[PDB]
Curated annotation (Swiss-Prot):
Family, as annotated: Belongs to the PI3/PI4-kinase family.
Protein name: Phosphatidylinositol 4,5-bisphosphate 3-kinase catalytic subunit gamma isoform
List of residues that carry Phosphothreonine: 802
Organism encoding this protein: Sus scrofa
Segments forming domain PIK helical: 329-511
Residue ranges constituting the C2 PI3K-type domain according to the UniProt record: 175-314
Cellular component aspect of the GO annotation: cytoplasm; phosphatidylinositol 3-kinase complex, class IA; phosphatidylinositol 3-kinase complex, class IB; plasma membrane
High-level lineage: Eukaryota, Metazoa, Chordata, Craniata, Vertebrata
Primary role: Phosphoinositide-3-kinase (PI3K) that phosphorylates PtdIns(4,5)P2 (Phosphatidylinositol 4,5-bisphosphate) to generate phosphatidylinositol 3,4,5-trisphosphate (PIP3). PIP3 plays a key role by recruiting PH domain-containing proteins to the membrane, including AKT1 and PDPK1, activating signaling cascades involved in cell growth, survival, proliferation, motility and morphology. Links G-protein coupled receptor activation to PIP3 production. Involved in immune, inflammatory and allergic responses. Modulates leukocyte chemotaxis to inflammatory sites and in response to chemoattractant agents.
Keyword terms, alphabetized: Angiogenesis, ATP-binding, Cell membrane, Chemotaxis, Cytoplasm, Endocytosis, Immunity, Inflammatory response, Kinase, Lipid metabolism, Membrane, Nucleotide-binding, Phosphoprotein, Serine/threonine-protein kinase, Transferase
InterPro entries: ARM-type_fold, C2_domain_sf, Kinase-like_dom_sf, PI3/4_kinase_cat_dom, PI3/4_kinase_cat_sf, PI3/4_kinase_CS, PI3K-type_C2_dom, PI3K_ABD
Amino acid sequence: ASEETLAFQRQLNALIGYDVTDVSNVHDDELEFTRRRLVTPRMAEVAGRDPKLYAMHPWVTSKPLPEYLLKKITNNCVFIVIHRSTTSQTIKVSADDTPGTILQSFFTKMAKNERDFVLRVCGRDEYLVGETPIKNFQWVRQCLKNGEEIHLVLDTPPDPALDEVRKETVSLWDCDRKFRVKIRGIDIPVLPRTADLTVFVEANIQYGQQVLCQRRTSPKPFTEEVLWNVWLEFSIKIKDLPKGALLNLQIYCGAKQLLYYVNLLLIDHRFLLRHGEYVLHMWQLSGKGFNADKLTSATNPDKENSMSISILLDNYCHPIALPKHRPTDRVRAEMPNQLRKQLEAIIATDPLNPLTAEDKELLWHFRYESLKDPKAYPKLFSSVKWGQQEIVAKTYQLLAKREVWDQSALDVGLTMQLLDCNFSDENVRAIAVQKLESLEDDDVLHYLLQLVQAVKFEPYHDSALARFLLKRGLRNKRIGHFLFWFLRSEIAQSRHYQQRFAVILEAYLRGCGTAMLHDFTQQVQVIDMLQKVTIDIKSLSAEKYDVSSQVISQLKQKLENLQNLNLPQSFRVPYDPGLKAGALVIEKCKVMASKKKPLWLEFKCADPTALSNETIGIIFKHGDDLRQDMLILQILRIMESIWETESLDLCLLPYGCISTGDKIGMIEIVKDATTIAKIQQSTVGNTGAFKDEVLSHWLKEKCPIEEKFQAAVERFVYSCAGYCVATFVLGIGDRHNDNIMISETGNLFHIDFGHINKERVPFVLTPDFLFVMGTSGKKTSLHFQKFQDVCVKAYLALRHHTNLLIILFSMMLMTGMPQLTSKEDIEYIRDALTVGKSEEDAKKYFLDQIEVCRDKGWTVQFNWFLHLVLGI
Ligand SMILES: *c1oc2c3c1C(=O)O[C@H](COC)[C@]3(C)C1=C(C2=O)[C@@H]2CCC(=O)[C@@]2(C)C[C@H]1OC(C)=O
């Protein structure tokens, strides 16, 4: 290992934010083993990607043009403005022309080596190239909807050389003996403050979040060291242990409640049975009383303060689990009319609905019949007795013939269901991933965060899903960019999965290319520098007192030093990679008058071809985990895409928001916007006597032109409806006025989500909102009626994708929540979506929620004010 190799590893660890070679918190070589195994997948993808297309990362879609965009185009034509220097001409092209047919058509119009130029969006690293109709480019579709013009510049294609990549005994199943483990003792440096506590150890053999067998030790006084030296034998036979099963060890604390836990994979990555002595440091349960963290094979790295449990496993030779080999029978394709019909009723049931013992027997007995319907796969494989060798073997025989599933249409919702906490079998999970291979880059982008979170449900570090993500990231820069940040936010805030995520990110970084490696370095530099600034200014972490003029002046000064000669002169915006930020506009920079004192920063665009002088407003938030906001915003983007397929535009505004490290992140500053509470405070003040006409007045004053005002109101009508529906389905509608913003164009949008007997409301639809829509009293109106229709429309449209939302919601709660979630928490979504109900009842249900808000008036906002502002 030369200084070079060591040096390279060093920088990668800096980009990752974790030392991927660290072995201070491992009891085996699974992680290192995974690093080695990911080497081939990475190299294979690197050598298979096109050097030019990878360099210009065209952002396209194969989806049809939405109904609301079809209107925007007159006669299959599109106008584009091409620039040179100041030199610029406007051309009219066909919506189906390829960027090549464009340039060739440009050289013929204006005329007085040759085709060595490329079309790039003005002021952005976004290229319109490749054999694709101009109308199938995301930027083109964006401009259309926004009504903005399409300005492209004629520059030289980026040399793909800049993406250069650096140089690169035997026992079988048979073991009729029952599995057993010995609990030696538990040890903890410091113990709780009640000192009359009792504790016992519970050992579970879990699979797919289900307990196959459980054993417990007797209760003993809770002291720094508690020894048992007792053997716990389980009712399951060694030969019946399925690959991916875990020995879940938990400690309960009572008086004389789960408090500590740690897991250990029974069958390792090499198909060998786990044996030997083990000293495992456990995690402490925060929820005094469930989630992805409880399934981790990772141990707590903090040895000096955590609880550890010492156990002993059977130590003989080396029993190895034999990989299945499909031989072939009873397909039994016929059943009684009633039986058949009651089988289809079980399958037709929603995800959250539990299966009874009898329900599972029918599904399993008629496996092959159930196999004919993809939507039955989750229920079917959840009816498999995974704790039985014979049954599992039969399960693989069943999956052998997957022609029906192989030909089935890609159903993202259905696929995600097989990648959650309920399935630990590699074969079942692998078939879900098989289907994901069909997703085009644009769709991978919509579900990327969710897929990354799903890696937490994988029993092993190396899996089909982890490799899938690696591959798509290496194949497309935009996906690679976001993958980088999503993995980095987990590695920095999650000790439960940081080791596994670090291995996956290192594999991506060794194949993304020199150019991207340089971009990531600059972005990370700015974030590290900005973070230290928030750490150097000690008062920034003090919520007790307000922000003085001296601290702000101190902020401007420190930003000045950095900018002199140390801070990157330009970097890509984490949440908007196509945009390059340049120098800071120290004058407009400051410390927000917020309790959390976030940095309000403004930069200039580093791209000179930018057709504007507006700054890039970025909030550098510190002291807050922004992972939940990212999840909420992404689910909102998913709702947008869902509404797009149903041909609907709810005008949501999922602004940029990305966690960039440990309790730090960057948030997009929406231009020309203010808080609803702010608008109220200007007229009234620091009191709860809210006026109903303030909002409308504010909007009109911002839109003195007839046409403009009605355009804004219509926008308000849509955006208000979109958020009411969206926030209601997610169960986060009852919010304080200061968490809702509005732009001068009338766009309403919720912000600052954070970790989210009395008066309650389903969502925010206050008198000021109803006012803008021309409704004062309890009387209807033209705009309000529209509002009601749009709400119903968007609402029903979401129900058409119930299973998708249900699974997305359950995973989000399980992976993006500190505390433990229950079935009750997940079931909320099922009720909010009126599952089982007919469209009619559903339409009325939502309309009823709209009525609750009218009767409530300002009541709820007034209580929020009394609480949040007056501490009442
Ligand atoms: C921490 O989520 C957000 C914010 C915070 C915070 O503590 O203060 C404010 C919100 O105060 C109610 C932050 C910085 C803001 C946003 C946010 O999501 C908004 C997202 C869209 C937008 O324009 C932002 C950046 C405004 C910003 O609020 C203010 C009052 O400047």
